Amino acid sequence: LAYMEGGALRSMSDKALGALRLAVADNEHLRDALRLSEDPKRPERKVQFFIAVYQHLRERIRQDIIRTDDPVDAIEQMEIELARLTEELTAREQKLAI
Amino acid sequence: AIRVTQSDRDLFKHLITEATSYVSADYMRHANERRTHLDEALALRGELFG
Amino acid sequence: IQSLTARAPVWLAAQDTLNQLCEQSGETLASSNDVTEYMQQLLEREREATVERDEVAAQKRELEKQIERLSQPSGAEDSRMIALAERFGGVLLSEIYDDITIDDAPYFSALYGPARHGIVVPDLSLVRPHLETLEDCPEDLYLIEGDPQSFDDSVFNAEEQTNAVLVKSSDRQWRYSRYPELPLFGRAARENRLEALNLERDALAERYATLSFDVQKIQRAHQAFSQFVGKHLSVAFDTDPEAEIRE
Amino acid sequence: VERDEVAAQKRELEKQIERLSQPSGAEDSRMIALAERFGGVLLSEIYDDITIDDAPYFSALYGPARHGIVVPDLSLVRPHLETLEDCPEDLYLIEGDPQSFDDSVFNAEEQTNAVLVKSSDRQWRYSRYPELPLFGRAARENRLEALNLERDALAERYATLSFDVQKIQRAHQAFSQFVGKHLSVAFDTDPEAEIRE
User: Could you say which residues form the signal peptide (chain B) (predicted)?
Assistant: First the structure.
């Protein structure tokens, strides 16, 4: 992004915020943090919001089947699980009984 | 199982993307603003001194 | 400077994707040829992991088939035998010996030999008309005559020996059966053995799960590298523009 | 992936053919040793040459007893019986002349594609006609050749797939070299016009 003008950066930021408002509608902690983040004169608030998001995700990982703490890395494991489960779903068809 | 994992993956993948973009774009905009301020300071300093 | 500036963003995007990709792997890439050789090593790991996966799958299939033979109703060649048991006024022999103890089970299994899973039918002439119709049955069907409710020991020319039994089946014919372990009859503890088999098959299922996961991981890694080269080589491994612009 | 698949199937066929150890189709040597230990001969060895047309009928007739020793005495076995431990778990023995083996005692009655045998008092045995009978083997070379035909078909398919993969890899190397040495100028316009200007 270093080789872009500020107008494009603001456009992306605004559209991302538009998506976030809907994504985070139900939660309250994240909603409060996002609310606090939008004053341009206090930048660290945005990174604090980011930290809140990451922690919130880490609680929801369900490590019974997954081990990565970083969610971004956990995406690949969910993808692998989908592929493997779809493969197991194939067929057996040895059906014969009383 | 495929249903549950599908829901979890969709949620993660969308929320993480929006959070990351929203935060990082502003971070870089601040970096560029600081660079512009430094350039302005040096230019006006140079011509003032000369 | 204008040329370098136009070129820069593409090179930077390419570098970020490359760093993510190689860091995701254990080895660090440095050139196009290097990436290709890494492709080849990835293929070799695919075709090894798949072999172990398939072999474990074969063992698991054998285990389920073995377990299934011991299931129902009195574990036997159940596919046709149950219908064949009711289509004549008879009872399955293995079912008559459902209750026998573990100590007499090997003896009886040796005694009855292949005929363990025959049917008891007290006349054997009433089947003679039905018989021509049997086109759907095990390749060797055994029939015995006696009272199904209080069946007497079939007249065998039997003779007990050390850990074995001798029998005269016919004039000028004898059979000699050695005591097996974990027999057919006594289908009370044969549930004990299928319990042992369930415990055995659990491990195969677990191991197969891990191997399949590994194969999928390798396949997706190859997909990632292919996607990369599809979208990336135009500027891969080129010299850094930040440096030259600074200069 | 496909050439590896074909190689695996060809291994399976080769394993199946190898399982035809001796002479063509494996026969248990332990039974030969047992036939040596008692005066007699292995039954399949006696009927190994019967016609393929009647072979399924005979195999249906004998049932499990197909693998057994023809001992005309039955006096040598009984003393040695308690001495037998390595033998197959269900050993079968028949009495008759090994050189000219008279029909075994079966009250056999022939049904449509099946046989019925009154084995003993209060016992009948019923069997259907199989294929690949133990008798009338004649080495069953035709099955070995059918398996060889299948194996050679798999080998040929494997050869074609290996050749195809080699072609594809060569094309890949060509492209790698090209983007390594001409990509910087690929698809650009002719400079002579600009030079003229």
Answer: none
